[PDB]
Amino acid sequence: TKETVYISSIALLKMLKHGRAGVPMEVMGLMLGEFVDDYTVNVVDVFAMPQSGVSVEAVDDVFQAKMMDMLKQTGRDQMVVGWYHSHPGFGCWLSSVDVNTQKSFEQLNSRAVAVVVDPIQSVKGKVVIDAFRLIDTGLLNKANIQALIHGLNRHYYSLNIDYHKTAKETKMLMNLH
Amino acid sequence: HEKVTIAPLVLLSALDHYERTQTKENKRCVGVILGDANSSTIRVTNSFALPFEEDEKNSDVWFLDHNYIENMNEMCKKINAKEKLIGWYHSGPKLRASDLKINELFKKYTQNNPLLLIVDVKQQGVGLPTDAYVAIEQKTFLHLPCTIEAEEAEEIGVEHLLRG
């Protein structure tokens, strides 16, 4: 089993709408949800960080505490499971800065994930999004060996991404379409 | 004439608010809607949840946190300056007796006649799961025409969520 990030309806849409708003600037925000299995990360919600490029310095500790404090008053009390950021027109990949930013997220929680969206490429009719973690310290699968090596090469690897919707969201989605 | 355009994200957020607060049979959730009222068609593109309690036995008793509106709205402005506070939402299923009074309070946060969207989170229903209202003297609620609109980015999102 592959490690998989399950993205909720509202998390996907809020990331797409924020990233598209920020174009041509890179934007970022935090991801809320839970870690489950070794192989499961659930992203239930996200929220935007104000603009200031994207780095640890863009993470506004007071904005974040105040957001989490208010969210908790309205029944949203999930921990931060990582962060997302757009890059408009470049693929989904981490630069050296993103890796440092992720290192810092990882220090807090070894399981944190980095989500990268490209909102410009998404309007081709396909959502371009991926998730990543860093990789720290007879029968095989050839393709997975090939990915552990390209991963080792660049210091991070990608996770599978899936979308979760409840049966009531599905019904609502089908009337919004 | 007067039309309302609603982004999909808005209806999914109200449903996620209703469900995450374990909102009881007969009870409701309430929040704020943001967008652009500066045209003949009011565009609703965002929302946030409010702490709200009312008395099941006594429709004239209810509490809405005023500090939370100002404090959340000031955080929304830091993300999107053009996304104004334009009205409010509740999960219904129908208009309540206190709604005109509540609507009055929201006048102090909007620069338009506040829009009330009633979101059907019970799915008991054949099409668009939100009805829009505006208070007028002609005081009473006027039902408005409403339709779905979101920017290209969200529309691809929705299709990806169904196809996936």
């Epitope: 089993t1 399950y6 299995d37 499961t40 239930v44 919707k165 409840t166 | 469900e19 374990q22």
Partner: nanobody
Amino acid sequence: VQLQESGGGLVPAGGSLRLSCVDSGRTFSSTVMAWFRQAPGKEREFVATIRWSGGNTYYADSVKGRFTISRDNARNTVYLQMNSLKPEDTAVYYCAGGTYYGTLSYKYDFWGRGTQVTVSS
């Protein structure tokens, strides 16, 4: 109603019970099943969860080493084997289905009516 739990009742402290849940599967799909429990005056609390296929499981801290969740795929049944029961384990127990692999109750799609478990004090 699509799910229907059984097993459960009164048992002394230190005792054992096996809960079961049958899914008719005539309205709702599910790739995940879970147990939850609700004590009088308390929030519904996640107990355990399992995927129909593969059968990967995950448990609440207070229940690890004592409770086992398992499933009979072909018979569409989930089981909770509860060993070393304590008074604090007393609650109505609910099986729940949906597509979400995790602990949040409002991510689940449908519920049984519940079965009462009472562990003598």
